[PDB]
Design a protein around this ligand. Structure first.
Ligand SMILES: Nc1ccn([C@H]2C[C@H](O)[C@@H](COP(=O)(O)OP(=O)(O)OP(=O)(O)O)O2)c(=O)n1
Length: 534
C-alpha cells in the first residue's frame, strides 16, 4: 500500500522502485497516467507523471522496460533497471505475467501506481532471496537478462519503416486472388453461396455434394480434403483471408503519428523455452518461405539513406544438438563444412560415399528436422509417404548413425525424471513434473518439452547473448537493432556503413560462445527485408 507515515514528496532518493499506470495500452501509444516510487517504507507520488520521469536515474520495478519505451518516446534516456519479472521468470519459465507472480509470490497486482511501486520493492526483495543462492541463474540475470531489457527497449522505441504504398497495392493483389478462388468455388458448387456462413458451407459439403463424415467437431473441413478439387480451394481461401486481415490490412493502421514506423512489442518472459516474442504484429506468424510471407516481408523498409542488414543463425538447433550430445559424427559434419542433409543420407543409406542422392537427401532432411521436437513414425510416413516398417527403420537408422543423440535423449528424460526439471547449456531451467504422468498424452508431451527445452532454449540464450554484446558496438558506428524473429536479427546501418556493420555483426554472433561446432550466420544487405535475404 505502503504503511504508517508512508507518503513523501516527489522525487524519491535513488534506487527507488518505480510504479506506473498507462492508458490501457502498449507503451509507445499510451499516455503516462500515474507515476510513483517506493523506497524504504515511503511512497513518493508524482504531481504530473511526465515531468517526473526526468527525476529518475533509471526505472527499477515491475515492467521497467515498458516505462523506458514510453520515456524514450519522450526524448529521455531512462535505462530499464531491476525488474522482479525477470527474476521470477528465471526461477520458473511459467511465471509470465505480473498478476500471476503477485498471486504466486504474495501480493495483489492492482491498478494503482503507488501500490504497484510498493509491490515491486517487496517482490524484488523476496525473489532476490530465492535467486542469490544460484550461480547459473544469477549469471544469466546480470549478463543476459538485465542488459537485454535495455536492448529490447531501444528496439521497441526505434521501430521499422513500412512501405504503405506497397501494402495497399498488395491488399488489392491478394483480394483479387481471393475473388478468383471464390469464382472457382462457386463453379464447383453450381451456385453461389456464402463461404463464411456455417449454414451454407455444410449445406454444400454435406448436402449438395454428399461428402464423407456425413457438423459435429467444428472446422472438420481439413481432414476430408480429398477427391473433390474444391475442399482445398476452401482452404487456400481461408488462409489468404486470414493473412490479409492479419498482416496486410491492419499494418498501415499500426504506424506511429510521431514516428512513421511500426512499433512491434518485444516480450522477454512470455515463452516456455525462453525465446523472445512479438506482439503487435506477432512477427513469428508471417508465413515464412511461402510466396505470400516473403511478399509481406518486402513491406519492411529501411530509413531513407540507410540499409537493412539481416543476419541468420544457419542451423542453430542441430549445431546445439551436436554440441550437447557430443556426437562425433554430427560434430564433424559441421566442423568440416559439409551439408548436414546430404551426409545424414550418406550415413543413413550407407551409400557408397556421397553418390547421386537427391530422393535420399529428402528423406534425411525430414528425419533431421523431425527428430528435434519428435515426429512419430506415422507422420514421418505421411510427409514421407511410406510404411510403418520402412519408417521405423529410417528412425533407428538415424540413431545407428548418430547414437550419442540417442544417448542424450535418454540421459535427458532420465536426469529430468530424477531431478524434476531440465536445463539449457547456460543453466536456464523449465520444471517438467508431468514427465511421469500415467495419462499417456500429457506425459508424451512432457517428454517432448523435456528434449526441446535444452535445444530451443540454448539457441534462444545464444541469440540473446549475441544481442547484448552487439548493442554497444553498434552505437560506436551508429546503426540500430530493429527486429528479432526466429533465429534472425535485422539491423539498420547508414548506406555508407552497411557492410562494415554486417561484418562486425557476423563476427560477434559467430564468436559469441565457444561450441564444439561452428555457428554460421548468413548476412544479407538490402533496402527492404526481402532483398536482404542472402
Ligand atoms: N520440423 C521442422 C521443419 C522445418 N523447420 C525449419 C524452420 C527453420 O527456419 C528451418 C531452418 O532449416 P531448413 O529446414 O531450411 O534447413 P537448411 O537451411 O539446412 O536447408 P537445406 O540445407 O536443405 O537447404 O527449419 C523446423 O523448425 N522444424
Amino acid at each position: 500500500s505502503p504503511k504508517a507515515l508512508e507518503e513523501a514528496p516527489w522525487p524519491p532518493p535513488e534506487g527507488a522502485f518505480v510504479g506506473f499506470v498507462l492508458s490501457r495500452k502498449e507503451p509507445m501509444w499510451a499516455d503516462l497516467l500515474a507515476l510513483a516510487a517506493a523506497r524504504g517504507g515511503r511512497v513518493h507520488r508524482a504531481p504530473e507523471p511526465y515531468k517526473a520521469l526526468r527525476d529518475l536515474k533509471e526505472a527499477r520495478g515491475l515492467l521497467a522496460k515498458d516505462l523506458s519505451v514510453l520515456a524514450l518516446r519522450e526524448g529521455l534516456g531512462l535505462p530499464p533497471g531491476d525488474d522482479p519479472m525477470l527474476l521470477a521468470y528465471l526461477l520458473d519459465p511459467s511465471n509470465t505475467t505480473p498478476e500471476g507472480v503477485a498471486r504466486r509470490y504474495g501480493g495483489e497486482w492492482t491498478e494503482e501506481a503507488g501500490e504497484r511501486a510498493a509491490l515491486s520493492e517487496r517482490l524484488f526483495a523476496n525473489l532476490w532471496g530465492r535467486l542469490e543462492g544460484e550461480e547459473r541463474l544469477l549469471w544469466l540475470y546480470r549478463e543476459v537478462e538485465r542488459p537485454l531489457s535495455a536492448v529490447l527497449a531501444h528496439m521497441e522505441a526505434t521501430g521499422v519503416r513500412l512501405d504503405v504504398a506497397y501494402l495497399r497495392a498488395l491488399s488489392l493483389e491478394v483480394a483479387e486472388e481471393i475473388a478468383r478462388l471464390e469464382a472457382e468455388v462457386f463453379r464447383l458448387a453450381g451456385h453461389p453461396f456464402n463461404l463464411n456462413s456455417r449454414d451454407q458451407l455444410e449445406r454444400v459439403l454435406f448436402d449438395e455434394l454428399g461428402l464423407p463424415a456425413i457438423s459435429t467437431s467444428a472446422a472438420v473441413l481439413e481432414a476430408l480434403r480429398e477427391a473433390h478439387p474444391i475442399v482445398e480451394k476452401i482452404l487456400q481461401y481461408r488462409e489468404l483471408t486470414k493473412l490479409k486481415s492479419t498482416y496486410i490490412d491492419p499494418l498501415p493502421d499500426l504506424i506511429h503519428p510521431r514516428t512513421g514506423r511500426l512499433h512491434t512489442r518485444f516480450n522477454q518472459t512470455a515463452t516456455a523455452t525462453g525465446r523472445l516474442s512479438s506482439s503487435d504484429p506477432n512477427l513469428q506468424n508471417i508465413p515464412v518461405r511461402t510466396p505470400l510471407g516473403q511478399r509481406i516481408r518486402r513491406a519492411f523498409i529501411a530509413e531513407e539513406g540507410w540499409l537493412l542488414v539481416a543476419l541468420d543463425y544457419s542451423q542453430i538447433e542441430l549445431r546445439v544438438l551436436a554440441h550437447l550430445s557430443g556426437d562425433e559424427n554430427l560434430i564433424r559434419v559441421f566442423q568440416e563444412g559439409r551439408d548436414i542433409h546430404t551426409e545424414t543420407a550418406s550415413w543413413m543409406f550407407g551409400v557408397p560415399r556421397e553418390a547421386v542422392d537427391p530422393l535420399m537427401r529428402r528423406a534425411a532432411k525430414t528425419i533431421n528436422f523431425g527428430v528435434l521436437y519428435g515426429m512419430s513414425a506415422h507422420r514421418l510416413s505421411q510427409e514421407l509417404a511410406i510404411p510403418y516398417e520402412e519408417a521405423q527403420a529410417f528412425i533407428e537408422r538415424y540413431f545407428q548413425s548418430f547414437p550419442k543423440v540417442r544417448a542424450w535423449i535418454e540421459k535427458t528424460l532420465e536426469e529430468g525424471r530424477r531431478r524434476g526439471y531440465v536445463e539449457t547449456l547456460f543453466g536456464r531451467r523449465r520444471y517438467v513434473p508431468d514427465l511421469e504422468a500415467r495419462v499417456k498424452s500429457v506425459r508424451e508431451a512432457a517428454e517432448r518439452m523435456a528434449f526441446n527445452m535444452p535445444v530451443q532454449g540454448t539457441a534462444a540464450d545464444l541469440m540473446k547473448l549475441a544481442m547484448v554484446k552487439l548493442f554497444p558496438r553498434l552505437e560506436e558506428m551508429g546503426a540500430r537493432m530493429l527486429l528479432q524473429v526466429h533465429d534472425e536479427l535485422v539491423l539498420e546501418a547508414p548506406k555508407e556503413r552497411a557492410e562494415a556493420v554486417a561484418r562486425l555483426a557476423k563476427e560477434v554472433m559467430e564468436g559469441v560462445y565457444p561450441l564444439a561446432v561452428p555457428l554460421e550466420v548468413e548476412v544479407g544487405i538490402g533496402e527492404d527485408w526481402l532483398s536482404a535475404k542472402e
